[PDB]
Amino acid sequence: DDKMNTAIKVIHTLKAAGFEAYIVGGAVRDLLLGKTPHDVDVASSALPQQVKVLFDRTVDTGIDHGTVLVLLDGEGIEVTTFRTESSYSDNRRPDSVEFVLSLEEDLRRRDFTINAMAMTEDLKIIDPFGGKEDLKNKVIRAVGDPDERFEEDALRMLRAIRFSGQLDFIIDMKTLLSIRRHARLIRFIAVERLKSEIDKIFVNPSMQKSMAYLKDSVLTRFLPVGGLFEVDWITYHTDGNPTYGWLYLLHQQKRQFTDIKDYRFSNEEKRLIEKSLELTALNTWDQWTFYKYTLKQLEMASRVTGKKKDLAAIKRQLPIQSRSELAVDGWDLIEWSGAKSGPWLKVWIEKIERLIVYGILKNDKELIKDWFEDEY
Numbered sequence: 001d002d003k004m005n006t007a008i009k010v011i012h013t014l015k016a017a018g019f020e021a022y023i024v025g026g027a028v029r030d031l032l033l034g035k036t037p038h039d040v041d042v043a044s045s046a047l048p049q050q051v052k053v054l055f056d057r058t059v060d061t062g063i064d065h066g067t068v069l070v071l072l073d074g075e076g077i078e079v080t081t082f083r084t085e086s087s088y089s090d091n092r093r094p095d096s097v098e099f100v101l102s103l104e105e106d107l108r109r110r111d112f113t114i115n116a117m118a119m120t121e122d123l124k125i126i127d128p129f130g131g132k133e134d135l136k137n138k139v140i141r142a143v144g145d146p147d148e149r150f151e152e153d154a155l156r157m158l159r160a161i162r163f164s165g166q167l168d169f170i171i172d173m174k175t176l177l178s179i180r181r182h183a184r185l186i187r188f189i190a191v192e193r194l195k196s197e198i199d200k201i202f203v204n205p206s207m208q209k210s211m212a213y214l215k216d217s218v219l220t221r222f223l224p225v226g227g228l229f230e231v232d233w234i235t236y237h238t239d240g241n242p243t244y245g246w247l248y249l250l251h252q253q254k255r256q257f258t259d260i261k262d263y264r265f266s267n268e269e270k271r272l273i274e275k276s277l278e279l280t281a282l283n284t285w286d287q288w289t290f291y292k293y294t295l296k297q298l299e300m301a302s303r304v305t306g307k308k309k310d311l312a313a314i315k316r317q318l319p320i321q322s323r324s325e326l327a328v329d330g331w332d333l334i335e336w337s338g339a340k341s342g343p344w345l346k347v348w349i350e351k352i353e354r355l356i357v358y359g360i361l362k363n364d365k366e367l368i369k370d371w372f373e374d375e376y
């Protein structure tokens, strides 16, 4: 609610210094759609060090690509010099970046017409490629020659799919046919960028339409384990967490986490998936189930099997929540047994823990001692 104002102030300051400056990218597209922008990018004739001269606080991490982050009025505004970029078939080499001297040299190499507009300080729209009419017709269309845009960055092919669902647009026919012809190029894209786009699709609207384009575009032929995305997505409803899309995909096909490990999940994400899948294969959940698994795993497993229980209340009403509340530890068992420390302690602590979680044995050291001396 303050980002557009701050971007306008940034533009005013750049122009006071004699430079050209415009709002570009998604913010123009969102403004024309009546949405509040997420991010507001500025394109300028200023070079990075000239931007830094004009603003007190700046972050420089993107300077090599022409970008300076300007910190103003509590917002961040990316300011990028007019530039073009090209990606090599080797995704180890940083992008080849070529500063250019005019706005339209920059705009004419962006991915889609609705993303290739600029807005002046006085709200005039610069639209050489017909983004306004594609926006009104709800069409995702590559700028210029679609083959060139997709050779410049193959991830754009998957971005088209993601935008279709995010905006409830269709993909321009000539553009879609170009994706089909170039879909093999997706193999050169870093898997982290692929996962980022797929995660967006999984939580965005009209995801079933996105997944149909994923197949129709022949991206599922060449994406890492891409055939696994061709499941029935009818009964998928996002919980806001993209991990649920991966879980859904795996559960629908009776597959395990190892089949999707090419996408380089965090250990935390991997655990949520694997533990949720275990729960879906567990025929009966009882107190020990609710104790040992996390509420988010219980909820995700329930969501994908179609159950609707009040999982939080069941877990909350166990006698204890976790091991740290147990009234006994291995050194109590060493004392009572007269035996030396060894792996046996873990076995006997778990026996006791189970009896406490089932509400059979009281979580009380002296009463546990009585039980242990009788049982051991």
Ligand SMILES: Nc1ccn([C@@H]2O[C@H](COP(=O)(O)OP(=O)(O)OP(=O)(O)O)[C@@H](O)[C@H]2O)c(=O)n1
Pocket: 024, 025, 026, 027, 038, 039, 041, 109, 110, 111, 112, 115, 116, 153, 155, 156, 159
């Ligand atoms: N692979 C890409 C990514 C970006 N763009 C250009 O860079 C702009 C900003 O990119 P991004 O930060 O990804 O913003 P959006 O296009 O709006 O994507 P999102 O809606 O997720 O923010 C895009 O609008 C487009 O003009 C591009 O041409 N090729």
